[PDB]
Amino acid sequence: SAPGDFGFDPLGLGEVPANLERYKESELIHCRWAMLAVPGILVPEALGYGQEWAALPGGQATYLGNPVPWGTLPTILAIEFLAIAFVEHQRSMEKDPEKKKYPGGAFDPLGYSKDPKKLEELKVKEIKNGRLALLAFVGFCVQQSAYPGTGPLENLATHLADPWH
Amino acid sequence: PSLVISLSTGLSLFLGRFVFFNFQRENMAKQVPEQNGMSHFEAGDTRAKEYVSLLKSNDPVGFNIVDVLAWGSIGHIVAYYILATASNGYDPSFF
Amino acid sequence: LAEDPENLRWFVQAELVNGRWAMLGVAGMLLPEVFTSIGIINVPKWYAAGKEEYFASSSTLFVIEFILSHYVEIRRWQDIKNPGSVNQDPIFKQYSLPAGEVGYPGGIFNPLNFAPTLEAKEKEIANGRLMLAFLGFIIQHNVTGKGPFDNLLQHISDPWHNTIVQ
Numbered sequence: 354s355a356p357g358d359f360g361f362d363p364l365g366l367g368e369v370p371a372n373l374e375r376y377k378e379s380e381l382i383h384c385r386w387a388m389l390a391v392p393g394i395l396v397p398e399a400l401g402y403g404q405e406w407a408a409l410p411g412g413q414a415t416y417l418g419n420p421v422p423w424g425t426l427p428t429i430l431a432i433e434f435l436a437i438a439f440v441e442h443q444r445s446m447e448k449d450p451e452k453k454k455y456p457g458g459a460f461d462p463l464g465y466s467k468d469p470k471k472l473e474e475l476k477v478k479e480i481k482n483g484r485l486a487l488l489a490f491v492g493f494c495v496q497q498s499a500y501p502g503t504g505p506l507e508n509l510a511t512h513l514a515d516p517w518h
Numbered sequence: 519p520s521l522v523i524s525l526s527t528g529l530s531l532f533l534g535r536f537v538f539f540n541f542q543r544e545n546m547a548k549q550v551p552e553q554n555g556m557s558h559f560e561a562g563d564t565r566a567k568e569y570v571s572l573l574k575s576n577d578p579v580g581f582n583i584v585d586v587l588a589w590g591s592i593g594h595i596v597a598y599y600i601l602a603t604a605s606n607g608y609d610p611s612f613f
Numbered sequence: 614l615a616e617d618p619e620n621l622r623w624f625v626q627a628e629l630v631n632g633r634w635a636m637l638g639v640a641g642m643l644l645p646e647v648f649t650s651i652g653i654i655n656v657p658k659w660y661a662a663g664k665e666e667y668f669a670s671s672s673t674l675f676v677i678e679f680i681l682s683h684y685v686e687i688r689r690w691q692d693i694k695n696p697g698s699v700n701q702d703p704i705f706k707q708y709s710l711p712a713g714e715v716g717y718p719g720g721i722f723n724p725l726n727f728a729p730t731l732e733a734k735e736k737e738i739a740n741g742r743l744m745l746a747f748l749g750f751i752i753q754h755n756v757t758g759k760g761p762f763d764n765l766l767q768h769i770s771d772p773w774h775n776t777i778v779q
């Protein structure tokens with residue numbers, strides 16, 4: 354109920370009209386990577402055999418020498434958060450109208466500034482699928498966010514289980 | 519179990535972000551501006567602050583971590599030595 | 614300087630929803646009294662359908678329905694601040710547009726209107742209460758009992774019972 358109608362400008366609007374949801378576009382493509390991750394299942398009866406980094410047997414190729422720290426996790430991790438600061442640097446150097454430097458004077462006549470630099474530009478369909486995805490990630494994704502030690506084995510009865518520990 | 523040098527690796531992540539500027543432009547301390555002697559009026563009650571100067575080496579010396587932190591931490595600090603060891607020196611891999 | 618009432622929309626609409634649901638509530642009872650035998654709490658479940666599966670549970674039933682009741686109810690909300698319900702027969706009643714000799718304010722006593730053919734939400738006035746206060750009655754007397762009226766042999770005469778609890 355946060356979007357229960359409220360918000361003015363640079364904070365209110367400004368932060369969000371595309372901006373934060375245009376950054377919540379990442380959320381969806383993360384949940385495109387993650388819903389490029391979960392689809393390990395998605396297709397039943399599939400051909401698999403095996404992989405794929407499962408429960409730690411011996412990483413990439415063991416290295417000719419004692420693995421750096423220990424575990425596959427820290428070696429693949431440490432890098433990820435430096436080689437992707439690439440994008441946000443570029444994504445956090447913009448402005449919406451014309452670009453020069455920190456120029457003369459450009460606030461408002463007609464045309465009214467602009468719109469999220471990358472506005473809707475129409476196609477108000479990204480958002481209709483956006484909050485649709487957000488509502489999912491946050492929502493009944495908690496169908497698999499509680500006690501999911503098991504997996505898929507439905508056996509006929511009904512649906513739902515009320516509340517309980 | 520504990521990556522102990524997970525994080526001492528980690529903290530001199532950042533204070534080498536400190537080896538910084540003793541070197542590169544001009545003097546020390548962006549030369550003592552205001553320290554001793556007492557900038558009037560402006561040291562007065564105040565200044566300066568600037569939400570606009572978190573760049574400069576964000577990109578360059580964000581490598582400083584992986585320096586010592588790589589090949590000089592878990593991978594046996596400088597094996598390429600020899601340079602006057604007889605009143606002793608060595609120095610010898612506790613690792 | 615706002616002398617007195619007021620209110621309006623208010624809890625005249627407050628009522629009729631009591632009235633007409635106390636009315637229904639007692640359709641609840643209606644059943645077990647002529648060809649009689651079956652009720653009280655009877656904590657139903659509640660009429661129960663086929664011999665093809667449930668089975669004590671198949672689900673929180675009860676719990677759900679009224680998630681639905683729920684946005685239908687925001688809907689009547691979704692009416693009474695700003696008048697929107699085609700028929701329009703509760704908010705003042707139907708007879709389309711009118712009654713609102715109390716919609717823009719200034720009441721005091723204002724009786725109201727609303728059936729085209731014909732008369733009114735009026736002698737649906739007092740079936741309105743008969744049933745609210747009836748419930749009052751109805752789940753008054755459980756808390757000790759559960760049945761009405763035989764003949765003049767030995768029932769309707771109240772023989773011997775047992776305090777309130779105490």
Ligand SMILES: CCCCCCCCCCCCO[C@H]1O[C@H](CO)[C@@H](O[C@H]2O[C@H](CO)[C@@H](O)[C@H](O)[C@H]2O)[C@H](O)[C@H]1O
Nearest residue numbers: 614615616617618619620621716717718719720721722
């Ligand atoms: C809505 C806002 C909150 C309400 C609180 C404020 C109430 C208003 C106070 C009234 C202001 C002064 O009003 C004042 O003038 C009247 C006439 O000019 C005077 O009234 C007097 O003169 C009349 C001459 O025939 C007599 O018939 C009256 O009985 C007599 O009371 C009083 O001195 C007083 O009533």
